[PDB]
């Protein structure tokens, strides 16, 4: 009873792991926030990327993801979603990554619609500083 959608992102998921070049991202990232594609496939694709670049890291990725947090209407699904989304925007930085500083700076700055909860979340837990 597997869906065809999941079967898709799945296959590709194993593809990237077969080539960590700058092309995959040069096409994926952009599509993650091109025109105005449904926040459905877009979100799912967001987890596939992070899962791959789990080891690597980049700010640009946070640039597009940020713009999304804004236009975020949540008018679609309103049940269990902040968790996952929060994870990425969070785990994305386990430690040693000033990038987090530049983030909270933008998030909060850009008014305060519905990102406070996430602001305090990533705010407290961040630079683990593993001695």
């Amino acid at each position: 009873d597997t869906k065809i959608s999941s079967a898709a992102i799945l296959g590709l998921g194993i593809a990237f792991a077969g080539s960590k070049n700058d092309e995959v991202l040069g096409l994926l990232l952009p599509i993650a926030a091109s025109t105005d594609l449904p926040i459905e496939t877009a979100a799912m694709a967001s987890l596939a990327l992070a899962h791959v670049f789990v080891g690597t890291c980049n700010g640009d990725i946070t640039t597009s993801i940020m713009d999304n947090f804004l236009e975020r209407t949540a008018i679609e699904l309103k049940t269990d979603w902040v968790r996952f989304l929060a994870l990425a925007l969070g785990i994305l930085y386990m430690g040693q990554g000033e990038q987090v500083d530049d983030v909270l700076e933008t998030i909060s700055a850009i008014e305060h619609p519905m990102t406070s909860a996430i602001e305090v979340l990533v705010g407290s837990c961040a630079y683990t500083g593993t001695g």
């Binding site: 640039t63 597009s64 940020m66 933008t106 850009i110």
Partner: protein, 78 residues
Amino acid sequence: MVSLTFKNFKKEKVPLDLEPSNTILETKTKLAQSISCEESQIKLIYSGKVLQDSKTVSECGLKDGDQVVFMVSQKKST
């Protein structure tokens, strides 16, 4: 002859020269003609306070040789 620095998100500085009169419209235009990105997506912020195209530099609260916060978007915007 005030020269400020516009930082994006990668912690990069983009020096720019303006005047008490010059407004965000122009700073946005230049900052866009410097990096090669349209100002229709750019977000000219100021100390975590997204400025406004309706505010000049004097109103922005900037001074001689300061720092401005900004960011670029991906939406081409119609």
